[PDB]
Amino acid sequence: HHMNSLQDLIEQAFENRQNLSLDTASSDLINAINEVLSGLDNGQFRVAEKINGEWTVHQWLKKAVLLSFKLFPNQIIDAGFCKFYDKIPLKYTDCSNEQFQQSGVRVVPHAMVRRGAYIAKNTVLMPSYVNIGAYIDEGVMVDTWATVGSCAQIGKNVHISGGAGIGGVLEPLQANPTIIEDNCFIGARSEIVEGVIVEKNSVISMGVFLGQSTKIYNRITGEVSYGRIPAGSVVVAGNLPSHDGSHSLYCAVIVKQVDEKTRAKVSINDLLR
Amino acid sequence: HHMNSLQDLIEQAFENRQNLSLDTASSDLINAINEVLSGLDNGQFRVAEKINGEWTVHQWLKKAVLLSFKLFPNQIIDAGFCKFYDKIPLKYTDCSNEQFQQSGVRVVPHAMVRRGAYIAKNTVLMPSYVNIGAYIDEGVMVDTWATVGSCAQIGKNVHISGGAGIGGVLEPLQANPTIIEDNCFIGARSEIVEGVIVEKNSVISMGVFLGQSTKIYNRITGEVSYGRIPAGSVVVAGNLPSHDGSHSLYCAVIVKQVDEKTRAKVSINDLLR
Amino acid sequence: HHMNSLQDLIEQAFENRQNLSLDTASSDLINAINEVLSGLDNGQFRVAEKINGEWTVHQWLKKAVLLSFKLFPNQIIDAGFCKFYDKIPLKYTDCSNEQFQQSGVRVVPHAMVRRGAYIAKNTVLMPSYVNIGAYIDEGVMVDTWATVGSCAQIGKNVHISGGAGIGGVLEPLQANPTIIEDNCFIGARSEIVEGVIVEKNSVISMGVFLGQSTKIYNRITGEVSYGRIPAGSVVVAGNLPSHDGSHSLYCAVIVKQVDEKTRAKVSINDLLR
């Protein structure tokens, strides 16, 4: 009932967003948006959720985030030696030592996290970026210059390697965000975007650039598909030849698939060799 | 006349740069260099300019920037929790809230911009880097861990996606900088360097690494070229086969070309599909 | 004798690491670990070393670093506008202006370096990351969003281009770290990881993703190899065709090899053309 009331305020405001402005926003509404941001930040709200074995999206959460961008004023952020200027608060500002201990997260300087992103215990953030609305479950490693984009869902024990990006999905509203399920390895410099889902136990090698337009070639079956890496897939960068053989175009290739039992026994290097 | 006098000081100093030093620089010259840096920073000077339909370069502006690197001393930059040490001032230091409002730029923490780069209103800098001499026109999105290199010219409404880089061109003096014209999309992890020009309305997909040595294959015509993406081109990563078929080498492929009318109607995803 | 005593303390502690903890660490041991960290930071210890023409690794140095991660407590790092939370000190904190001058390093804001990494004079760090245990020799350029990973050995006059990463190797203990020898060029967005060695005078082009599982095709000889770029190699991204020709998979291609005499005369662009 309480969340149904909060959702209602958000949806009615979003409906007439085209006649709202920073100078004209209900004080009760700016409070409501901040209530949703707080729930996203502490994990009690999450933008997408696996329900009855299906990933589902909560559009009203995206609407609250979209409304924060429209209605919140930019303010100076004073770093001493320089200034920034933005409207989205950072996650770790008034955080005490106890609170950091209780969180179980390591935030390596100078990793940057916006408020409205949840990050579970035993996660390590190397210098990296986590955007508003993201949900990072337990035991995740976010390596240097990686990016966890808006609303992205990162599962337990996922390894996002150096310079790898998980693309944000705030619009369209009905789109599932980019989802990396439990125990996935994302290799360095890869980029998984636009609501692609990488299912459980997958291994993505280096330089895999995977969006909704990227052909996925399954070399075992010979099928070409889009938008989903099935569970336990080993994925490498490849090419597909032209019809006349004059050239080839970039694609992702599924070179093997591995059950959970095997995934715990064989190393990533052996899987790619 | 006033700018012709300023240019003269810069050129005469640059001529005898090999006998200048940090301890021996005219006080009037360090002022002149700073006058050019100020004009670059507020957009009244720009390193390259489209004149009579041709992009042209102002070598004397590069010479001023080169002289700043030679003559300016490094100084401590105190970030409180650590120190840096460099000779190029940052753009946003003594900036007031009013000045940030007047600029119309959002500088998301912790985006870093050197002084001597111009950034026009309605631009959003995610955590990213903009180097000295760059010119970023109105409405540009610089996404997370993107880079706008020295002297780069970024047109209106350009989208530089996450982890994409626009390479700097300070030397050679006569070289046009890397130029991205109006309404271009630069896909994630791409890198456009070494004075390549991407003309108006082009769409560059992910993982396109494009420099002066990169073959550009036009699959419509079959031509191979270098250094220029014609207006309205859709560009993806590809390969070109060996003469004996033993291997292939990386290249960029122009897979379609689109007029301005079509460019506003069809989405980027549909263009790449 | 003094270093043999220090090594002994480290090795005996590492042996019974599984029964050590942050709350139970010898005060004399936390001092010993800090002595090794200091020696790594000032270059008097280095994790790997070329001895009698062979690169060798000092496992006990890695053990000290591993013990710092286990035993050092996380602490708040106060950046004023936000906080971080980590257990590894930064290299440049109490550094004076004189010390920065004496170091000969430029640390461009906001490049981040952990303590326990050595960086020699005439090196320039653009905003980038250098991890604990790395050794960066004289005259190196680390460009924007590059990464020098843990224990990596970077030779004199190496150029790590924008967005390029040198992968860390802390485990396995016996593995040589990723090694880039003198006068190598590492092109933008490339990633050299997992203890690959790039020998002297090599030129690596853009988008080269090179780990222990990456096939290296030598187009002059036709040989496929792993883990080593021989001295003077020019390396570009390529593909290798499927046995049935349905697809190809990513690889690195050695397209030329160049002696030291030629390497100083011919430009990188001419080498790749």
| DSSP-derived secondary structure for C145-194 | T-EE-TT-EE-TT-EE-TT-EE----SSTTSPPPEE-TT-EE-TT-EE-T
Residue C47 lies in a domain: yes
Contacts of B167 in chain C (CB under 8 A): 162, 188
Q: How far apart are CA A181 and CA A175, in angstroms?
A: 17
C20 and C59, same domain (yes or no): yes
Structure tokens at A264: 């715990």
Which residue's entry shows tokens 């990563």?
Answer: B237
Query: Does the beta-carbon distance from B76 to C219 stay under 8 Å?
Result: no
Please, which residues bridge with residue A107 across strands? A125, C85
Instruction: Compare all CA atoms of chain C with the CA of B188 and give the residue at the minimum distance.
Output: C189
Please, which residues bridge with residue A221 across strands? none
**A1: Cβ contacts below 8 Å, ≥ 6 apart:** none
Measured between alpha carbons, how far is residue A266 from residues A259, A263, C184 in Å? 11, 6, 34
Residue B65 lies in a domain: yes
Closest CA to A157 of A144, A142, A143, A138: A138
Phi first, then psi: give them for residue B251, nearest 5 degrees: -160, 170
CA A205 to chain C, closest CA, distance in angstroms equals 9
Contacts of B101 in chain A (CB under 8 A): 74
A132 and A58, same domain (yes or no): no
- Domain holding C61, by residue range, is 1-72
CA A97 to chain C, closest CA, distance in angstroms equals 6
A59 and A98, same domain (yes or no): no
Closest CA to A252 of A237, A270, A273: A237
DSSP symbol at B41: H
C130 and C199, same domain (yes or no): yes
Report strand pairing: C83-86 vs C75-78: antiparallel
A243 lies within 8 A of chain B by CB? no
A122 and A221, same domain (yes or no): yes
| Angle (deg, nearest 10), helices A2-15 and A27-41 | 120
Which residue's entry shows tokens 């008034």?
Answer: A94
Known catalytic residues of A are 143, 168, 191
C191: annotated active-site residue: yes
Residue C98 lies in a domain: yes
Nearest CB neighbour to A109, from listed B81, B92, B237: B81
Query: Does the beta-carbon distance from C83 to A100 stay under 8 Å?
Result: yes
Residue B62 lies in a domain: yes
Closest CA to C237 of B215, A233, A272: B215
Nearest CB neighbour to A248, from listed C131, C214, C248: C248
Q: How far apart are CA B85 and CA A168, in angstroms?
A: 34
B123 and B55, same domain (yes or no): no
C127 lies within 8 A of chain B by CB? yes
| Domain limit, last residue, from A45, A72, A99 | A72
- Report residue A233 CA to chain centroid gap: 20
Measured between alpha carbons, how far is residue A30 from residues A71, A90, A91 in Å? 8, 17, 18
Please check if C143 is assigned to a binding site. Answer: yes
Structure tokens at C141: 């350029």
A92 lies within 8 A of chain B by CB? no
Q: What is the secondary structure of C89-112 as a DSSP string?
A: -BSSSS--HHHHHHHT-EE-TT-E
Residue ranges in chain C assigned as alpha helix (H) = 2-15, 27-41, 59-71, 97-103, 260-265, 268-272
Closest CA to B146 of B190, B104, B176: B190
Structure tokens at C140: 């190196």
Peptide linkage before A110 cis (omega within 30 of 0): yes
Q: How far apart are CA A1 and CA A3, in angstroms?
A: 6
DSSP symbol at B114: B
C232: annotated active-site residue: no
For residue B53, is it left (φ>0), alpha (ψ between -120 and 50) or beta?
Answer: left
C4 and C133, same domain (yes or no): no
For A257, the 3-state DSSP assignment is: strand
Please report the resolution in angstroms: 1.8
Query: Does the beta-carbon distance from B80 to A82 stay under 8 Å?
Result: no
| Contact (Cβ atoms closer than 8 angstroms) between residue C264 and residue B265 | no
Measured between alpha carbons, how far is residue A51 from residues A7, A55, B259, C73 in Å? 19, 6, 44, 39
Phi first, then psi: give them for residue C229, nearest 5 degrees: -105, 110
Nearest CB neighbour to B247, from listed C90, C126, C253: C253
- Report residue C46 CA to chain centroid gap: 11
**B123: Cβ contacts below 8 Å, ≥ 6 apart:** B104, B105, B106, B136, B138, B139, B140, B141, B142
Residue A1 lies in a domain: yes
Binding partners of A (≥3 Cβ pairs within 8 A): B, C
| Angle (deg, nearest 10), helices A2-15 and A59-71 | 60
Q: Looking only at Cα atoms, what is the longest distance across chain B?
A: 64
Report strand pairing: B248-257 vs C233-241: antiparallel
Count how many domains chain B has.
Answer: 2
Catalytic one of C41, C137, C181, C191: C191
Please, which residues bridge with residue C106 across strands? C124
Among B239, B250, B251, B253, the residue to mutate for chain C (most C Cβ within 10 A):
B250
Task: Give every strand in the sheet of B147-148, ordered side by side.
Answer: B112-113, B129-130, B147-148, B165-166, B191-192, B209-210
Angle at B232 between CA B230 and CA B233, to 5 degrees: 65
Contacts of B209 in chain C (CB under 8 A): 187-189, 205-207, 237
Residue B199 lies in a domain: yes
Known catalytic residues of B are 143, 168, 191
Q: Using CA atoms in the order C204, C209, C213, C217, what is the torsion angle rounded to 10 degrees?
A: -40
Contacts of A212 in chain B (CB under 8 A): 269
Binding partners of C (≥3 Cβ pairs within 8 A): A, B
**C174: Cβ contacts below 8 Å, ≥ 6 apart:** C57, C59
Q: How many CB atoms lie within 10 A of CB B49?
A: 13
B138 and B61, same domain (yes or no): no
In terms of Cβ atoms closer than 10 Å to its own Cβ (0-12, 13-18, 19+), residue A5 is exposed
Contacts of C237 in chain B (CB under 8 A): 209, 249-250
Nearest CB neighbour to A78, from listed C80, C165, C193: C80
B93 and B56, same domain (yes or no): no
Measured between alpha carbons, how far is residue C178 from residues A115, A164, A238 in Å? 36, 19, 25
Instruction: Compare all CA atoms of chain C with the CA of A240 and give the residue at the minimum distance.
Output: C247
Residues 191-220 of A with CB under 8 A from B: 191, 193-194, 207, 209, 211-214
C103 and C65, same domain (yes or no): no
Please check if C106 is assigned to a binding site. Answer: yes
Which residue's entry shows tokens 């770290």?
Answer: C177
Task: Give every strand in the sheet of B135-136, ordered side by side.
Answer: B118-119, B135-136, B153-154, B179-180, B197-198, B228-229
Q: How far apart are CA A103 and CA A101, in angstroms?
A: 5
Residue A52 lies in a domain: yes
Residue A151 lies in a domain: yes
Query: Does the beta-carbon distance from A81 to B95 stay under 8 Å?
Result: no
Report strand pairing: B147-148 vs B129-130: parallel
For B89, the 3-state DSSP assignment is: coil
Residues 10-69 of A with CB under 8 A from B: none
B234 and B103, same domain (yes or no): yes
Closest CA to C85 of C95, C74, C94, C96: C74
**A47: Cβ contacts below 8 Å, ≥ 6 apart:** A40, A57, A58, A61, A62, A133, A135, A151, A153, A177
Structure tokens at A206: 């280096």
Nearest CB neighbour to C249, from listed A90, A162, A236: A236
For A203, the 3-state DSSP assignment is: strand
CA A200 to chain C, closest CA, distance in angstroms equals 22
| Contact (Cβ atoms closer than 8 angstroms) between residue A131 and residue A150 | yes
A200 and A100, same domain (yes or no): yes
Instruction: Compare all CA atoms of chain A with the CA of C166 and give the residue at the minimum distance.
Output: A162
Among C76, C83, C96, C108, the residue to mutate for chain B (most B Cβ within 10 A):
C108
